Nucleic acid binder design. Sequence first.
RNA 1: GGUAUGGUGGAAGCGGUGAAGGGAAACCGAGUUAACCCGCCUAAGCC
Length: 118
Amino acid sequence: YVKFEVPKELAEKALQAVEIARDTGKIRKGTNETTKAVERGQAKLVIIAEDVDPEEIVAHLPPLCEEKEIPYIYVPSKKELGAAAGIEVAAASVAIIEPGKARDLVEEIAMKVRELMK
RNA sequence: GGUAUGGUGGAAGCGGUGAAGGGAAACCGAGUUAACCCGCCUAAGCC
């Protein structure tokens, strides 16, 4: 499901974006909530973590992100993001719905995937 | 009358790879599951 390579520091900027968006606005976390967030177009950003077995459980979500034109990014460890998502469990995927104070920043980080193509 | 299988107070397992628990399902989306000691409140159900 890993479509494009990402910097780990940029993944960190994304993670901090998920924290700030968690506190100041609405988000969803785990594949179910987050794919449902895409399908309903509420997803303003999709955060995937690459350490996932089975791969397939996340595999369906990234194409939909380009299919519904929702930005998507990778983060090194689902555990670290689950902690960033404010839960006690590793979370393979997360979505920012309401960016909150993170909004501008996420736009900027979104720009990176715009570049990440090809 | 009495009696915790209900509840209050005190010195290891399932779980966002979706737990329990509601619900016919859709759908919810975060914590649940503890007979262990005493000492309190309660009486369905029981003698």
